[PDB]
């Protein structure tokens, strides 16, 4: 929904998307941790910039693959609110439209990279959930 | 003396997964003997029937999966794996989501038309709603032929400046129609506003 900061669950391993203060991005399961609270906004129709509410870092790879959090609203942070008919969402890089880099979840809570995602994955389908056990 | 055997993916405690999908809870384990098993969704026993389409089980690698999911079977679901020598168990929360891949829904009746003396001025309002996160903007038909834009969203202008127009010392400049564009991938449309001005 619009309203709230919401969390990104990726079904592969279930991980929630969380941005640690040093800038690096993975997911793990405890939903007490402080950095999975994200609220989203739109520069435009197609895309969204995601930011951890408490520490104020957006998500931005660069060609990199290396899923990092940037301090600046820059040309690294802007990925696609993809809603596929299986109702999960997904998110793929600004940097391109090139070759489907997408946001992932390796089964072990260590996703990366974008060269090796595409060809599936189940690593990529995310759900927006609420704060609570609502 | 029963024991859970290969944490395959018990580290997947949560399974958020959209309506009608399915969803596989496994609880292998072991111990001598075969441990009768049973299962719990936040309480005492859960059987079948309490779901239409039933259940179907495996007392063969003992686990559970079911399928075409709906929101009313929400909750925590508990492995329990016992013999005479003890018992083990695990618990899985299930979170059924429901998306509407339509484009933003707009409240009936907004924004509503208004009027005040010049030098005064009053507002028109838009309400978000609600899934594919919308990108939002108002326009007005002036100029000789097209409308021209209020100012964007994601423009670094947040939850506050949210159109909620503000019209300082309302001139007759402003005279005309005001409309409310907010889109996602599905498309976009809304209703609209004229100002009855003095």
From Swiss-Prot, chain A:
Domain of life of the native organism:
Eukaryota
Q: Does the keyword Secreted apply?
A: yes
Against Pfam families, the record matches this protein to: FGF
The segment annotated Heparin-binding runs over 106-122
The effect of residue 106 to E is: Reduced integrin-binding. Defective in integrin-, heparin- and FGFR1-binding, and defective in inducing FGF1 signaling, cell proliferation and cell migration
Assembly description? Monomer. Homodimer. Interacts with FGFR1, FGFR2, FGFR3 and FGFR4. Affinity between fibroblast growth factors (FGFs) and their receptors is increased by heparan sulfate glycosaminoglycans that function as coreceptors. Found in a complex with FGFBP1, FGF1 and FGF2. Interacts with FGFBP1. Part of a Cu(2+)-dependent multiprotein aggregate containing FGF1, S100A13 and SYT1. Interacts with SYT1. Interacts with S100A13. Interacts with LRRC59. Interacts with CSNKA, CSNKB and FIBP. While binding with LRRC59, CSNKA and FIBP seem mutually exclusive, CSNKB and FIBP may cooperatively interact with FGF1.
Q: What is this protein's function per UniProt?
A: Plays an important role in the regulation of cell survival, cell division, angiogenesis, cell differentiation and cell migration. Functions as a potent mitogen in vitro. Acts as a ligand for FGFR1 and integrins. Binds to FGFR1 in the presence of heparin leading to FGFR1 dimerization and activation via sequential autophosphorylation on tyrosine residues which act as docking sites for interacting proteins, leading to the activation of several signaling cascades. Binds to integrin ITGAV:ITGB3.
Descriptive protein name: Fibroblast growth factor 1
UniProtKB/Swiss-Prot annotation, chain B:
| Stretches assigned to the Ig-like C2-type domain | 2-95, 104-196
Q: What effect on the protein does mutating residue 101 to R have, as reported in its record?
A: In APRS; common mutation
Q: Which residues are glycosylated?
A: 76, 89, 113, 156, 169
Modification after translation is described as: Autophosphorylated. Binding of FGF family members together with heparan sulfate proteoglycan or heparin promotes receptor dimerization and autophosphorylation on several tyrosine residues. Autophosphorylation occurs in trans between the two FGFR molecules present in the dimer. N-glycosylated in the endoplasmic reticulum. The N-glycan chains undergo further maturation to an Endo H-resistant form in the Golgi apparatus.
What are the start and end residues of every segment in region (Heparin-binding)?
9-26
Name the consequence of residue 100 to W: In APRS and PS; common mutation
What does the record say mutating residue 20 to F does? In PS; requires 2 nucleotide substitutions
| Disulphide linkage map | 27-79, 126-180
Q: Altering residue 131 to N: what's the impact?
A: In a lung squamous cell carcinoma sample; somatic mutation
What does the record say mutating residue 126 to F does? In CS, JWS and PS; forms disulfide-linked dimers with constitutive kinase activity, is retained in an intracellular compartment and not detected at the cell surface
Reported effect, residue 180 to R: In CS, JWS, PS and ABS2
The protein's job, in short, is: Tyrosine-protein kinase that acts as a cell-surface receptor for fibroblast growth factors and plays an essential role in the regulation of cell proliferation, differentiation, migration and apoptosis, and in the regulation of embryonic development. Required for normal embryonic patterning, trophoblast function, limb bud development, lung morphogenesis, osteogenesis and skin development. Plays an essential role in the regulation of osteoblast differentiation, proliferation and apoptosis, and is required for normal skeleton development.
Domain remark in the UniProt entry: The second and third Ig-like domains directly interact with fibroblast growth factors (FGF) and heparan sulfate proteoglycans. Alternative splicing events affecting the third Ig-like domain are crucial for ligand selectivity.
Name of the protein:
Fibroblast growth factor receptor 2
Protein's organism: Homo sapiens
Portion of the full sequence shown? 153 to 360 of 821
